[PDB]
Symmetry: D2
Subunit: 25 residues, 4 copies
């Protein structure tokens, strides 16, 4: 449970970092 939830959270963070990278372009 916990490690799968953390894994999903890291993917959510990764998606947001790509959004910020684009905003930064």
């Amino acid at each position: 449970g916990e490690l799968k939830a953390i894994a999903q959270e890291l993917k959510a963070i990764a998606k947001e970092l790509k959004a910020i990278a684009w905003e930064h372009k």
Copy 2:
């Protein structure tokens, strides 16, 4: 640039944590 590399690393880490979760 670096933010997209960090994002790719975090996706790779997510994959590894799912594997560890099953072990556990």
Copy 3:
């Protein structure tokens, strides 16, 4: 702003993973 909030979250996650590592 958001990058510093994400950094704080990642430090919190790091703390939790250390706890899980001991369990396992």
Copy 4:
């Protein structure tokens, strides 16, 4: 071992995100 190494890596990532946040200021 592995989860402690990942934890250290997430702290390393967090430090770099703060560096990028500052560069963005």
